[PDB]
Symmetry: C3
Subunit: 308 residues, 3 copies
């Protein structure tokens, strides 16, 4: 049987992503009804950098599937350094049934997935955050119903992991995705081209614009994220001035549909990419969105384990 | 309607009695209560590591059917853009309770006003209320009724054990004496809260520099590490112990620096209940969790 | 009496055979034994971290129905804050067994002298007895009966793997050879203990600087890294003396044609072992690594029922 991995959002076809999201809704209703890891079987959860959301959602989600998460800070273990990556993956494949890895370069994930004989999941990387976007899609479906044909606009740094994954995962769900970002901060060209091609299959579309007002108008869903990740703090750029016109504020939200909702991958810098009034107001779905990391990641793991 | 346990007086006298009864029932049947079956999650967060706090809470939560997500001090420095209100809101979607070892009471109070699940003070600078629940469980199983008993704490009277022994002690009806040198006395608002609670239970509060009179007729003698000249007269030694009531029991929340605040002869002797006391952290904290969860 | 496992000879030949049989049974049926159901707790304490030791113990304890409380080295180190005796007395109230990776053997002996639960040496400076249980399980599943096999270890002859292959090997009736350069020889007390145990089992102990002689006709070839972190600053050139003892294709070709190769991992490819040997048909290093899980579960089951 071919071993399935989930490193980027387009690793699932449109029909596959729909199966995962339906399973996420089922598991939210009945959270201990699927026990593929009963035993317990192990799952490795490896961090090159920590995250409250990633830690809590995976460790508890794996336990609720009957399994046992072994949670490792790769800084402490010096992964890749004390032995080859291939040697590590061969031994992991003997102790666990899946590998969940938060790491930086996408090439590292690809390397691990090409040698491991268990599913590899990208918990969060520099280029993609596909588990967050599964949770986002679950949240949108909860509140709006059918995903096909919705209009979603993302604002801020157009080349970070959330911009890339909202493009790929959004068009895989049939959502028309707009990225509003200033010049110099636009999506990676190969990611954009992949999203445009996948959008053809689903009847969705990809738009990239510097006009925040135009991106917000008529939108069903508005999304933003922090303007700067940790690796970019020393990149030499002013990472405030280019982004101020793209702030998700009350004025911008008033341009979207009356029933629009707001999403934000945590953490948030209130006053930069998003204001208190929007973050804490009635259109915000950020806390359900964070909860749904637990359910959507469980669904992904059930689905990958069962097909591998 | 969400109950928290940040200081000993957060429990009324009747409520503390319920928790201690539950601790005794759970010591006898440790897997008979499964409110976290699933597993449901509990966060166990350390701003500063505490190995013995981690053992008792992590195993206790598991024996309730749950799964402890244990976060050590290394991640205390939250990353860029992380807050406390937002952390509390997210934790409340993943876990059914939050156990937190932090420093200032201000931080505990802040988490508790935002979180929609119970918050437990695992250990703080001002109070150690889970240790005192275990201490009261230890006294009761060895001596029976706590009301009327006479307890004396020796040493640093300004630290978290002195404060919690005052508040939790008088909540149980114990006559509490702190014996401490001049610069190391209870915080005055804590002392006043304890004097107030004591009127409801028939207990009392005494603060003295006279170790001999604190030990004289004591039923329970407690000490704790000092951190050093001002504490030497309060050393819990063979000599003070002779002054107490017969069958008096000695407590010490660990670790002990043998030959500083307490002697080998007292700690290894037949008055010592220090090992049962340490075990009872497990039972008393499980009881507290069961009790908080069913009211929240 | 409470049984501890601090060194390989803590098990008699008969008891070691019982543990290894249990490891084969647990490999077949990994969740059929639940002595820690509840869960009961097991302490897994690291004075220095070992990730593969963490994985195997943490999952193994869970599959016995228990809950491992894992303490990494980022906590205040045992012994500094209170006596080891005091710490052992508290641990004994919280858990049913203590698994500990520490440094000198006297710390293990101290903890076991007072603990009322079994103490297991996860890994120490002098011995690695759980790794050698996994090694023996691997050899037995690749070779059948252990008695009379010839095993040669190459490299630093005084590290924990050399000492444990000597002790655990002769306990199983294996003729053990340590091939090491002058000045890196087994501890004499350990060599004498292995020589005495070998009289009971028909085994033998050989120590030699002749790598070629040690490889010739061997059934099992073993090596390990030449240097631990603790040794990086010891002032020795820790490469030149060891290159004649590299486990490479030429050395392997001297052994029996059905010989297998073990390495407790991690490996430094190109130093103590070559890519060709470690990725070739004689290598059993991946089954070896997996068997840490099964052999340590067997040990825990066995110690818990005898204590
Ligand atoms: F699979 C093993 F063996 F347990 C493992 C896992 C990790 Br994550 C590691 N990081 C450095 N060495 C490692 C070894």
């Amino acid at each position: 049987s071919v071993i399935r991995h989930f490193l980027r959002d387009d690793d699932l076809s449109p029909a596959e992503q729909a199966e995962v999201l339906e399973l996420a809704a089922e598991l939210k209703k009945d959270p201990v009804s699927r026990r593929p890891l009963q035993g317990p079987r192990g799952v490795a959860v490896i961090f090159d950098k920590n995250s409250t959301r990633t830690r809590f959602s995976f460790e508890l989600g794996i336990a609720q599937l009957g399994g046992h998460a072994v949670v490792v800070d790769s800084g402490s273990t010096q992964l890749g350094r004390d032995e080859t990556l291939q040697d590590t993956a061969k031994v992991l494949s003997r102790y666990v049934d899946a590998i969940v890895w938060r790491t930086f370069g996408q090439e590292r994930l690809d390397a691990m997935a090409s040698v491991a004989t268990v599913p590899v999941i990208n918990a969060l990387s520099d280029e993609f955050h596909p588990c967050q976007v599964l949770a986002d899609l679950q949240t949108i479906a909860e509140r709006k119903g059918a995903l096909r044909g919705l209009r979603l606009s993302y604002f801020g740094d157009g080349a970070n992991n959330m911009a890339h994954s909202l493009l790929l995962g959004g068009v895989t769900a049939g959502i028309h995705v707009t990225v509003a970002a200033p010049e110099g901060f636009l999506p990676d060209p190969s990611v954009r081209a992949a999203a445009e091609r996948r959008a053809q299959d689903t009847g969705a579309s990809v738009t990239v614009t510097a006009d925040a007002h135009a991106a917000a108008a008529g939108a069903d869903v508005l999304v933003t994220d922090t303007w700067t990740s940790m690796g970019q703090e020393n990149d030499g750029l002013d990472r405030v001035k280019p982004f101020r016109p793209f702030q998700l504020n009350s004025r911008l939200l008033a341009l979207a549909d009356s029933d629009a909702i707001v999403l934000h991958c945590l953490p948030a810098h209130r006053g930069d990419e998003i204001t208190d009034a929007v973050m804490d107001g009635p259109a915000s779905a950020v806390w359900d969105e964070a909860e749904n990391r637990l359910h959507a990641q469980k669904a992904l793991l059930v689905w990958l384990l069962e097909r591998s």
